[PDB]
PDB file of C-alpha atoms in Angstrom:
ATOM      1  CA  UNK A  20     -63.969   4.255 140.054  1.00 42.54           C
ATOM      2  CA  UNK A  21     -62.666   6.640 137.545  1.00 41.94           C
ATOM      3  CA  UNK A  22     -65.272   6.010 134.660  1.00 43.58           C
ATOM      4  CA  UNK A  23     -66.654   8.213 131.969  1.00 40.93           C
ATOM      5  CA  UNK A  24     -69.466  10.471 132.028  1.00 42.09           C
ATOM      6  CA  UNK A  25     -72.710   9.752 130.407  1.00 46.13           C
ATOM      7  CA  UNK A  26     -73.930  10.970 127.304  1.00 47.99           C
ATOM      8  CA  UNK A  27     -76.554  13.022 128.034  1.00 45.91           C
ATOM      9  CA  UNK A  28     -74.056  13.965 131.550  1.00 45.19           C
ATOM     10  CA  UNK A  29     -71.695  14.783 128.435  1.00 47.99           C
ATOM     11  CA  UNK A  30     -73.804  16.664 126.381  1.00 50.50           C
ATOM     12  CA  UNK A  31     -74.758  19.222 129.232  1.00 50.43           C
ATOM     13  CA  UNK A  32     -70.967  19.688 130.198  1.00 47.74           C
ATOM     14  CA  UNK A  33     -69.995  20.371 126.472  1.00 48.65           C
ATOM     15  CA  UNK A  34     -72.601  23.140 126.394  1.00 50.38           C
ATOM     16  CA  UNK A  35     -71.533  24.578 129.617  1.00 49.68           C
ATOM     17  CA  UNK A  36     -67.927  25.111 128.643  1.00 49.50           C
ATOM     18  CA  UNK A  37     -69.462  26.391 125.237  1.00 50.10           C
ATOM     19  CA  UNK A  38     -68.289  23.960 122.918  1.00 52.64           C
ATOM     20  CA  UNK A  39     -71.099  22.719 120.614  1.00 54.11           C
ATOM     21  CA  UNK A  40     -68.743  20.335 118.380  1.00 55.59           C
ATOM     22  CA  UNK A  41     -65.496  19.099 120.429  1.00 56.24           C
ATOM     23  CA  UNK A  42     -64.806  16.945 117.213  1.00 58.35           C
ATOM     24  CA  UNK A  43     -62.303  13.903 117.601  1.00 58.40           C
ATOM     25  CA  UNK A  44     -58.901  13.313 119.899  1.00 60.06           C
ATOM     26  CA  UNK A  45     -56.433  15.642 118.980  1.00 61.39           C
ATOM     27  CA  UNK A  46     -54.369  18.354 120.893  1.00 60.82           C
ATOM     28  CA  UNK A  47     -55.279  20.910 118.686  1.00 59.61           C
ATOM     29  CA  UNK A  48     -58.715  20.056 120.229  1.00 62.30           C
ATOM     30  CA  UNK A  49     -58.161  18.998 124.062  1.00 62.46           C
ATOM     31  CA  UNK A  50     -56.431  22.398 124.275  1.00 60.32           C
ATOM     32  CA  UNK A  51     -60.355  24.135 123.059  1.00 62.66           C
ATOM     33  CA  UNK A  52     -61.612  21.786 125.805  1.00 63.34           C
ATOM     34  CA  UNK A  53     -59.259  23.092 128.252  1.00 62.68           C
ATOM     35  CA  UNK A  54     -59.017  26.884 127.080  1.00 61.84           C
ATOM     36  CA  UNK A  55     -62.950  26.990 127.411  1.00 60.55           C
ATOM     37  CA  UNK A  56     -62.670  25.085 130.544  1.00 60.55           C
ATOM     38  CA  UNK A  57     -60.627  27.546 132.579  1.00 62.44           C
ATOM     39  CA  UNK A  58     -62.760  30.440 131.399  1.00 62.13           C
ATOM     40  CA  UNK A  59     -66.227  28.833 132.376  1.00 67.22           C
ATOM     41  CA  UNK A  60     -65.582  27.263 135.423  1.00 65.24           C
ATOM     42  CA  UNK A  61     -63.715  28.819 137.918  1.00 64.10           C
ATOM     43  CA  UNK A  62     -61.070  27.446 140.823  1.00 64.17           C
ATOM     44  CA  UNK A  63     -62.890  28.597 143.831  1.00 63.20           C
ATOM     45  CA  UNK A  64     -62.968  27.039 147.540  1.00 63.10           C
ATOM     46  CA  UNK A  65     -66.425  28.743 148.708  1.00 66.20           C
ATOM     47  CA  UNK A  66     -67.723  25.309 149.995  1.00 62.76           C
ATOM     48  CA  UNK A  67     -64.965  24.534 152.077  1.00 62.96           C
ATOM     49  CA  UNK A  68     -65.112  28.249 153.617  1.00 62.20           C
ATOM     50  CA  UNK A  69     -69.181  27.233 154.315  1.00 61.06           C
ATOM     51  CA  UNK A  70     -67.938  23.896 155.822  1.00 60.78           C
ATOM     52  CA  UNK A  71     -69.800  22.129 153.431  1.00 60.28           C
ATOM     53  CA  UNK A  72     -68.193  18.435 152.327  1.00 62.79           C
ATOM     54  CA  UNK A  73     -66.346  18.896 149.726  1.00 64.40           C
ATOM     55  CA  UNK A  74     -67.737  14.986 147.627  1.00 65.47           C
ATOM     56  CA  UNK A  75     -65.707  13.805 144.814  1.00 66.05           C
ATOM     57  CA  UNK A  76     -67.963  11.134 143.058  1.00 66.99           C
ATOM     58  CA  UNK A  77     -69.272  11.789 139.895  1.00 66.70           C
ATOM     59  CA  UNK A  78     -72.787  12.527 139.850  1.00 67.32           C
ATOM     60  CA  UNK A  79     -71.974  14.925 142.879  1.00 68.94           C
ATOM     61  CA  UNK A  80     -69.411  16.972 141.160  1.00 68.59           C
ATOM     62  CA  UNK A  81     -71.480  17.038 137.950  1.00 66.28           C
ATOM     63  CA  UNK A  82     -74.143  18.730 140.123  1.00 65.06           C
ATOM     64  CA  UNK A  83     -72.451  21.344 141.537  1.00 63.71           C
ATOM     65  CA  UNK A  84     -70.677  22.593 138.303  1.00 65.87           C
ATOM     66  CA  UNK A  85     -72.412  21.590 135.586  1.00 67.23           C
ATOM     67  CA  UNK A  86     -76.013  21.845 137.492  1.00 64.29           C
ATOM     68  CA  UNK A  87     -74.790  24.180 139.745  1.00 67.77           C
ATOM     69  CA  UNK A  88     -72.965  26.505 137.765  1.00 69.14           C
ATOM     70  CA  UNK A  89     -70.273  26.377 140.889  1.00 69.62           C
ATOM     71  CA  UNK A  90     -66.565  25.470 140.278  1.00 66.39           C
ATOM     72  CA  UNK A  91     -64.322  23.906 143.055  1.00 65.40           C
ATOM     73  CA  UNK A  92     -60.681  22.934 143.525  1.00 63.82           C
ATOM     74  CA  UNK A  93     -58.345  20.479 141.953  1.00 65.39           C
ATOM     75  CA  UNK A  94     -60.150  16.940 143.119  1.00 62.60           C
ATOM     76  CA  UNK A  95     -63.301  18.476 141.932  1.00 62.53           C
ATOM     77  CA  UNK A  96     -62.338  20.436 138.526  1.00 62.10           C
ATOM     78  CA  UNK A  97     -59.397  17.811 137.382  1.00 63.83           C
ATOM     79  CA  UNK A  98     -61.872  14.568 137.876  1.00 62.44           C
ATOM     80  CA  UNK A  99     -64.776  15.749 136.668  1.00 60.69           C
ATOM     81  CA  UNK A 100     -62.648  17.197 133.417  1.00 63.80           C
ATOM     82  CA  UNK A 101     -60.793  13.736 133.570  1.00 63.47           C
ATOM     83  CA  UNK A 102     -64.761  11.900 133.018  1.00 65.85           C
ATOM     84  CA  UNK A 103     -65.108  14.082 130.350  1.00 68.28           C
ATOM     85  CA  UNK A 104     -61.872  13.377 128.346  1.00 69.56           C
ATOM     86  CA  UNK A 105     -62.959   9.638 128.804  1.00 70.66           C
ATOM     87  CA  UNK A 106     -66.250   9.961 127.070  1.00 72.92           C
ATOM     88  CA  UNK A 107     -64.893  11.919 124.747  1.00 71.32           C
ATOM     89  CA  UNK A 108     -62.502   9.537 123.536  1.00 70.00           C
ATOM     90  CA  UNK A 109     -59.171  10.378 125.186  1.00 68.08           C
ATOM     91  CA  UNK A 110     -56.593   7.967 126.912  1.00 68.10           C
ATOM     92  CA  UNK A 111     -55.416   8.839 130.281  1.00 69.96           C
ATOM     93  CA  UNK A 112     -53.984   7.844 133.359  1.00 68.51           C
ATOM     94  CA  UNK A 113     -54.401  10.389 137.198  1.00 68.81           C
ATOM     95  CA  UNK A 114     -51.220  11.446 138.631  1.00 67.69           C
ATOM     96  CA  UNK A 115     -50.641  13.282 141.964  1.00 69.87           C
ATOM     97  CA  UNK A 116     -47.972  15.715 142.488  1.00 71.24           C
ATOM     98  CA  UNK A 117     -46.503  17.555 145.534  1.00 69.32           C
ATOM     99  CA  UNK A 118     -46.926  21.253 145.286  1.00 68.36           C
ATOM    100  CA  UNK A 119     -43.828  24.106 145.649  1.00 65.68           C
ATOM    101  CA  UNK A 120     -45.172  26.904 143.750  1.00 67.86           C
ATOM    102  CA  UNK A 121     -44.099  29.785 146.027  1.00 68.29           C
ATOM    103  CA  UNK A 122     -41.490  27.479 147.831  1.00 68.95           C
ATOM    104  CA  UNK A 123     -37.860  28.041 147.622  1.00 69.62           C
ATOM    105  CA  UNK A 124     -35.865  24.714 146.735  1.00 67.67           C
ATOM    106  CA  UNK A 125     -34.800  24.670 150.296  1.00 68.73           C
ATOM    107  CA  UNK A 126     -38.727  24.366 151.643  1.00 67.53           C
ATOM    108  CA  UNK A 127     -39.049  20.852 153.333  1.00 71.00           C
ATOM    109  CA  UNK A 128     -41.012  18.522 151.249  1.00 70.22           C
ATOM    110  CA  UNK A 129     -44.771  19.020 150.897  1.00 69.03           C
ATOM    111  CA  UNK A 130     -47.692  16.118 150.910  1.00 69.17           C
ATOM    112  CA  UNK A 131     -48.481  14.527 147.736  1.00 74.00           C
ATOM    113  CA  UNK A 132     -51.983  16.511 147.305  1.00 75.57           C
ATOM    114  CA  UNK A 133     -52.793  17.480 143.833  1.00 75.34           C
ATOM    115  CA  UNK A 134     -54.677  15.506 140.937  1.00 77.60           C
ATOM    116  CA  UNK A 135     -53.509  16.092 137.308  1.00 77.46           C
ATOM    117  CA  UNK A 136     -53.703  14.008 134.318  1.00 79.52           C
ATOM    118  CA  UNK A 137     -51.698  12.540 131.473  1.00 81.68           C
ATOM    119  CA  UNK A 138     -52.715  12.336 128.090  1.00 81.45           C
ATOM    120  CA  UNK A 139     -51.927   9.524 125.688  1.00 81.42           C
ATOM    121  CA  UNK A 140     -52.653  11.226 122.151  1.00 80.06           C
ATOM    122  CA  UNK A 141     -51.299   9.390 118.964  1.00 76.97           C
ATOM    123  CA  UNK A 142     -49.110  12.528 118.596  1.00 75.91           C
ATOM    124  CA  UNK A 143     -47.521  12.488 122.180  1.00 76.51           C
ATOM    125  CA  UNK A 144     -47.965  12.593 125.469  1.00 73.79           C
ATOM    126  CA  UNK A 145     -49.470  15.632 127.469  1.00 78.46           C
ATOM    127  CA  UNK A 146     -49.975  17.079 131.431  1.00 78.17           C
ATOM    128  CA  UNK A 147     -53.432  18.101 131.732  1.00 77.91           C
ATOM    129  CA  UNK A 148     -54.498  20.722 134.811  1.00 79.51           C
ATOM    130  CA  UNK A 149     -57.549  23.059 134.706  1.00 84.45           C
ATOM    131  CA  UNK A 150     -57.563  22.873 138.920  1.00 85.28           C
ATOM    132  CA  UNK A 151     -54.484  24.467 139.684  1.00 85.25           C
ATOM    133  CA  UNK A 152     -55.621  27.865 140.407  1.00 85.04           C
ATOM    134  CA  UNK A 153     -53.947  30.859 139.491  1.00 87.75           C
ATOM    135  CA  UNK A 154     -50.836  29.372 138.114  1.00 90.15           C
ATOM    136  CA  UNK A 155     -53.021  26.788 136.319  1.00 90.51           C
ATOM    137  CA  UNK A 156     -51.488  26.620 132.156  1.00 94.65           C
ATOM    138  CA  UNK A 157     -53.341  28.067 129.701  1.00 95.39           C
ATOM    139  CA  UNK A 158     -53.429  24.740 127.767  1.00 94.12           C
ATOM    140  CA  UNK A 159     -51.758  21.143 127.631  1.00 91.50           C
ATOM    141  CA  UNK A 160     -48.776  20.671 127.821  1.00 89.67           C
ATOM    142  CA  UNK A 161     -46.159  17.961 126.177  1.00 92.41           C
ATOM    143  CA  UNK A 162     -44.478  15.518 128.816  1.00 91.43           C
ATOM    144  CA  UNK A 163     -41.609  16.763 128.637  1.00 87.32           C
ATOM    145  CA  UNK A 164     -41.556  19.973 126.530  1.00 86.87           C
ATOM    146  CA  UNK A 165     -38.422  21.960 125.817  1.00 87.05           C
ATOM    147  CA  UNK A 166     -36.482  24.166 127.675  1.00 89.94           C
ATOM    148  CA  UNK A 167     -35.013  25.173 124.620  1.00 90.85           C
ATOM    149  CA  UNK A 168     -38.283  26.681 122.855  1.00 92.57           C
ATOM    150  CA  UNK A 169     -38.805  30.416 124.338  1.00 95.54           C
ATOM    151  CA  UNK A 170     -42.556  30.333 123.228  1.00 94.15           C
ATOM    152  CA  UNK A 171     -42.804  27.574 126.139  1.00 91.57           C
ATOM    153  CA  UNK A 172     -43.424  29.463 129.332  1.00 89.45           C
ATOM    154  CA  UNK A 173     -45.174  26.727 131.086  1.00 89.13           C
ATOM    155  CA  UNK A 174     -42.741  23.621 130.640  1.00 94.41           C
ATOM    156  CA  UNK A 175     -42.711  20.128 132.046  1.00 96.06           C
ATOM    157  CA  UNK A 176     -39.004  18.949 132.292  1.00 96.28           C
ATOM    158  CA  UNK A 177     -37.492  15.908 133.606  1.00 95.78           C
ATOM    159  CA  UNK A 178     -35.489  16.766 136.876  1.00 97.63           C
ATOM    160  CA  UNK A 179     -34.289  13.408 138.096  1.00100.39           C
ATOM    161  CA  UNK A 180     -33.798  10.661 135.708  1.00100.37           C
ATOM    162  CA  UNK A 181     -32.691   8.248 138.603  1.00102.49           C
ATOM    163  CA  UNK A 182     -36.049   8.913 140.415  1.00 99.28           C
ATOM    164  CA  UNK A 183     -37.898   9.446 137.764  1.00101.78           C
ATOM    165  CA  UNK A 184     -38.930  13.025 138.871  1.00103.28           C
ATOM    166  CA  UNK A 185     -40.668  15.907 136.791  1.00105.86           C
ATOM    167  CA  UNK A 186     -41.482  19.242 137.397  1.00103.90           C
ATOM    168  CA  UNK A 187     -44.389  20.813 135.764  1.00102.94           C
ATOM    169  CA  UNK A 188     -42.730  24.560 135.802  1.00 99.83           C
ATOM    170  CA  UNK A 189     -42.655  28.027 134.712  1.00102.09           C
ATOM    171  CA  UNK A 190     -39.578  29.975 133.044  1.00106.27           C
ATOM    172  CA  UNK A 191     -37.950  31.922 136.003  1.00107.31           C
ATOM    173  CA  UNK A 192     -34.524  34.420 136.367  1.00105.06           C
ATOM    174  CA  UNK A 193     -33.633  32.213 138.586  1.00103.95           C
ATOM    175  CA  UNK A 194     -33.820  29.439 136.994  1.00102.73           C
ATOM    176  CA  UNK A 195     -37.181  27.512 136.724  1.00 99.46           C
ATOM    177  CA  UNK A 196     -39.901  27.645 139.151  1.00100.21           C
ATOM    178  CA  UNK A 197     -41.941  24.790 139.793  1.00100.72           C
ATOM    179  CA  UNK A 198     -45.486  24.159 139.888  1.00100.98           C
ATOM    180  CA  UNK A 199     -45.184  21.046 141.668  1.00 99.07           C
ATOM    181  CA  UNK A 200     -43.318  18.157 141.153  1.00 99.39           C
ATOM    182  CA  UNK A 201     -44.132  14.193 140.476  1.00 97.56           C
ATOM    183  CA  UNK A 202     -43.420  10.785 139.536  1.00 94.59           C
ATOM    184  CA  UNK A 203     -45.152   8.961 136.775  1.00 93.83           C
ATOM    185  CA  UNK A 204     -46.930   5.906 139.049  1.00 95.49           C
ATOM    186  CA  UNK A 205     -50.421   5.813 137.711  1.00 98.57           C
ATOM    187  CA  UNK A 206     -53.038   6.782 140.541  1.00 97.57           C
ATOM    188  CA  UNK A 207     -56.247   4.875 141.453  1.00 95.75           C
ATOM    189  CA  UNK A 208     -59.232   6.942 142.013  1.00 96.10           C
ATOM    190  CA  UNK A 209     -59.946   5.681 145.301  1.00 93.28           C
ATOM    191  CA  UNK A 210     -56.328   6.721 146.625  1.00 95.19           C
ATOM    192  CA  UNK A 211     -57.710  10.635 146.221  1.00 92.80           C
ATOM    193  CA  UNK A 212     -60.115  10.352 148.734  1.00 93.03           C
ATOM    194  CA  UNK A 213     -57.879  10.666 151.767  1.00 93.64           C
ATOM    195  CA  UNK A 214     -56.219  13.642 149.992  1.00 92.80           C
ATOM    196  CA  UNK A 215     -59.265  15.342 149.294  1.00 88.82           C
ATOM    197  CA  UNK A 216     -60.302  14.947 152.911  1.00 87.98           C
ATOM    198  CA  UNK A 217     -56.988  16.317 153.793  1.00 90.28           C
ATOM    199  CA  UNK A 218     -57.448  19.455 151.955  1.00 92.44           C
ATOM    200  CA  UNK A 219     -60.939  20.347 152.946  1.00 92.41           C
ATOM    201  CA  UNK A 220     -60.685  19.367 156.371  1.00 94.83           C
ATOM    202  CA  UNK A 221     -57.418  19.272 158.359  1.00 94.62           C
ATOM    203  CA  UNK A 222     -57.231  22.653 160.176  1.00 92.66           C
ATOM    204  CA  UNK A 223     -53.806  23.141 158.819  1.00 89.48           C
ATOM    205  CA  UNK A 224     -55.134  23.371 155.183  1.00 91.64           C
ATOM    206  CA  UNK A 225     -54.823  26.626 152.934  1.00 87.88           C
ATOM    207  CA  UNK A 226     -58.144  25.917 151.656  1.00 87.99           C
ATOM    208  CA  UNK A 227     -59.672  26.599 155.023  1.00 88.77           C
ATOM    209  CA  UNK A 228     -57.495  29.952 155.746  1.00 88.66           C
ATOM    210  CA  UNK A 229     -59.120  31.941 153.459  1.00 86.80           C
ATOM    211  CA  UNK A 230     -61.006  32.794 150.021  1.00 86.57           C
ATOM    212  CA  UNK A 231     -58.830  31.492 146.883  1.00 86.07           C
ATOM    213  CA  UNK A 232     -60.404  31.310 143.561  1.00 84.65           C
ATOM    214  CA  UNK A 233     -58.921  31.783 139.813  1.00 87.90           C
ATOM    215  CA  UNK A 234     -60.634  32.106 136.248  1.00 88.29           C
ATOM    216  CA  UNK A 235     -59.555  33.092 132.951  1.00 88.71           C
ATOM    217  CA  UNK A 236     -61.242  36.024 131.063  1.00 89.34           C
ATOM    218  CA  UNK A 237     -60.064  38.077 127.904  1.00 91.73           C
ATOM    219  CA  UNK A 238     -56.499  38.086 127.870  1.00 91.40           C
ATOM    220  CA  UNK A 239     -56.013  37.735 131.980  1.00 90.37           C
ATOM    221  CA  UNK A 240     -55.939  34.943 135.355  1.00 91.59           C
ATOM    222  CA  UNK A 241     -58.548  36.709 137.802  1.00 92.95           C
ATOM    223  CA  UNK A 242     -57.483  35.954 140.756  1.00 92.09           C
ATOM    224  CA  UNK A 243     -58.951  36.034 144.297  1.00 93.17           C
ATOM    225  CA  UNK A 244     -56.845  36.005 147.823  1.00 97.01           C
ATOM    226  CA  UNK A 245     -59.238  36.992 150.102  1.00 96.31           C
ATOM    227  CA  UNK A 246     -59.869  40.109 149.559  1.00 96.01           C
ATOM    228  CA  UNK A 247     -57.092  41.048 147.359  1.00 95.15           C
ATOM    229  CA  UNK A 248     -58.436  41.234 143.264  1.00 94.46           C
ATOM    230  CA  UNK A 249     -55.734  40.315 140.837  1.00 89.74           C
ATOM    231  CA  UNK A 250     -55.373  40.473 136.990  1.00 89.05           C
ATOM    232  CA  UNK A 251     -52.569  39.179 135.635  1.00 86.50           C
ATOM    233  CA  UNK A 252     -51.842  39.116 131.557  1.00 85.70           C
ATOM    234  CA  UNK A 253     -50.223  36.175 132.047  1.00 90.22           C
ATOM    235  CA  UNK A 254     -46.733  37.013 131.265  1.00 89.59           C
ATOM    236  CA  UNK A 255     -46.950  38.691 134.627  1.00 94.17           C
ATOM    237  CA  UNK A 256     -48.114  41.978 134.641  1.00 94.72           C
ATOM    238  CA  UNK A 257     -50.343  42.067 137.661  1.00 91.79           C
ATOM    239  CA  UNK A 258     -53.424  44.844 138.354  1.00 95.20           C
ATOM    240  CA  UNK A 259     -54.387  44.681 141.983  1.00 94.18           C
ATOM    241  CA  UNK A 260     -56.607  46.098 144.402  1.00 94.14           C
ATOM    242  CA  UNK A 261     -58.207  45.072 147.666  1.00 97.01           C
ATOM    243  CA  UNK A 262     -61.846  44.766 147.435  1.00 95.92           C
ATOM    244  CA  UNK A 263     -63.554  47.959 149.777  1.00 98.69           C
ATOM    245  CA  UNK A 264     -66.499  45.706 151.227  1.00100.67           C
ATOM    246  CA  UNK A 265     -68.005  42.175 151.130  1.00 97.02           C
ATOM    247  CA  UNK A 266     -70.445  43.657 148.517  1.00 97.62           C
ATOM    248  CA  UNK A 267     -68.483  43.869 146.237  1.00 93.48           C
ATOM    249  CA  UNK A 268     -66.585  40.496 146.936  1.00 93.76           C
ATOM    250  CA  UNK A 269     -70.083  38.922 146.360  1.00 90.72           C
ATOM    251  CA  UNK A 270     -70.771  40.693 142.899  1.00 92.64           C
ATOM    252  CA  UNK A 271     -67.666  40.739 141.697  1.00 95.44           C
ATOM    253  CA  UNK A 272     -68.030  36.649 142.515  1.00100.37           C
ATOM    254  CA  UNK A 273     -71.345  36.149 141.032  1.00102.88           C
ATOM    255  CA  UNK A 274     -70.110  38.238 137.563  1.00102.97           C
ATOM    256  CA  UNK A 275     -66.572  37.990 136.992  1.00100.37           C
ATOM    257  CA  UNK A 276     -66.438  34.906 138.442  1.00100.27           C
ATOM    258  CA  UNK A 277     -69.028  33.300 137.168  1.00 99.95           C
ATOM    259  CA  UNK A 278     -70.726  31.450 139.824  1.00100.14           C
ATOM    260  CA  UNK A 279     -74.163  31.228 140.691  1.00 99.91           C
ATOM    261  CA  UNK A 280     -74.852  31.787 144.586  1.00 99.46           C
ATOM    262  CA  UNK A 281     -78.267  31.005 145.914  1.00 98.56           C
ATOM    263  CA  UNK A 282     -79.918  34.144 147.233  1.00101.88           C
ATOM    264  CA  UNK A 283     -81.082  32.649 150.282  1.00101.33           C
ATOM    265  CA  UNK A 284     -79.333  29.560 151.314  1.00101.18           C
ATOM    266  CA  UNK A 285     -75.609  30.822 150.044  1.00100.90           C
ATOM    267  CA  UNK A 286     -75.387  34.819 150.038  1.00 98.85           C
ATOM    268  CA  UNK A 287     -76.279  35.552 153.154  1.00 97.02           C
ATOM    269  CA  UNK A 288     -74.279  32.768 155.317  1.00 98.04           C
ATOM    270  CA  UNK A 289     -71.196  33.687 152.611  1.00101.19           C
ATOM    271  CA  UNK A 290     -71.602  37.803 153.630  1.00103.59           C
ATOM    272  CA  UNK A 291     -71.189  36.986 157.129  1.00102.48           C
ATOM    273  CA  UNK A 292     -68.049  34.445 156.826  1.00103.76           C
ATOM    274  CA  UNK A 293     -66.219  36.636 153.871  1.00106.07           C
ATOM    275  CA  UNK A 294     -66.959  39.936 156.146  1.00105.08           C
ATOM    276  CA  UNK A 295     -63.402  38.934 158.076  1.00104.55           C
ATOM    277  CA  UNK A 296     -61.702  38.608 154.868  1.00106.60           C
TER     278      UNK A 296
END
């Protein structure tokens, strides 16, 4: 069941993400939530490359981030974000999209395998993601926004009124490019677990191909693909540069990254697996 952290649970997250006063529902402040969100807690899939479980109930996810000072992927990040929101104050509903960003239109259809949320403020509704990953928006953003406003890189737009489609996309030359796409049929928690089983255990899965992990810090998305160390200022100027040894993978993890590997029981078994990477 998708119910809200605790207080004290709440408390501990808040100072985490390095917000001492979140103050009352409003977008001007869900988008401090999510700003200081994507900067503390990174997208990362280290678990899954350890072929550890990847457990989506509450008190387990709490413990790995909060506790843990760990991040994880969109069934991790999105709910445990979504339990915040709720004891904040916030109204919501969980949505699941299908996923195209990199596809051309032509692609075949994809599986309907990412959580995101919408947001019921008294001044409109929102999409909220801080799992995506390296395309993940920098903040919240209106359902639908305008197409029309060139300040709106990141834009959710209504593709098919008959099926009641959306897109949650960025501003291409081509045209837009989506994110991934969805309907608006509220989700029930329960219906994530088979998806989140999917993702970090079917063979097939990208999450168990390789490293992927994303954070924001100054002005730039760091990005991980393996190896491969990417910067990107967010209107697309990209610094890259493949990492020379698992060395400096591991520190680059631990400080830019943000997360806190045990010396013993993670670093060593991590060396060994990112080594082919």
């Amino acid at each position: 069941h998708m119910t809200p952290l605790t207080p004290e649970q709440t408390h501990a997250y808040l100072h985490h993400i390095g917000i001492d006063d979140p103050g009352p529902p409003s977008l001007a402040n869900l988008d401090r939530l999510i700003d200081a969100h994507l900067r503390r807690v990174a997208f990362e899939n280290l678990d899954v490359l350890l072929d550890r479980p990847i457990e989506i109930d509450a008190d387990k996810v709490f413990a790995k981030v909060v506790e843990g000072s760990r991040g994880g992927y969109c069934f991790e990040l999105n709910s445990l974000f979504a339990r915040l929101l709720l004891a904040l104050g916030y109204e919501l509903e969980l949505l699941v999209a299908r996923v195209r960003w990199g596809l051309p239109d032509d692609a075949p259809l994809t599986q309907q395998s990412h959580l995101m949320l919408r947001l019921y403020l008294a001044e409109g509704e929102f999409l909220v993601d801080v799992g995506f990953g390296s395309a993940n928006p920098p903040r919240a953003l209106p359902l639908p926004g305008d197409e029309a406003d060139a300040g709106q890189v990141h834009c959710v737009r209504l593709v098919d009124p008959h099926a009641g489609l959306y897109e949650s996309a960025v501003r291409g030359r081509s045209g837009w490019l989506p994110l991934y796409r969805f309907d608006l049929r509220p989700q029930l928690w329960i219906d994530y677990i088979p998806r989140n089983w999917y993702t970090s255990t079917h063979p097939h899965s990208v999450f168990r191909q390789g490293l992927k992990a994303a954070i924001t810090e100054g002005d730039l998305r760091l990005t991980l693909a393996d190896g491969l160390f990417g910067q990107r200022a967010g209107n697309g100027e990209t610094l890259q540069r493949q990492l020379r040894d698992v060395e400096e993978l591991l520190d680059i993890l631990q400080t830019r990254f943000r997360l806190r590997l045990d010396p013993a029981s993670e670093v060593p078994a991590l060396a060994r697996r990112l080594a082919g990477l």
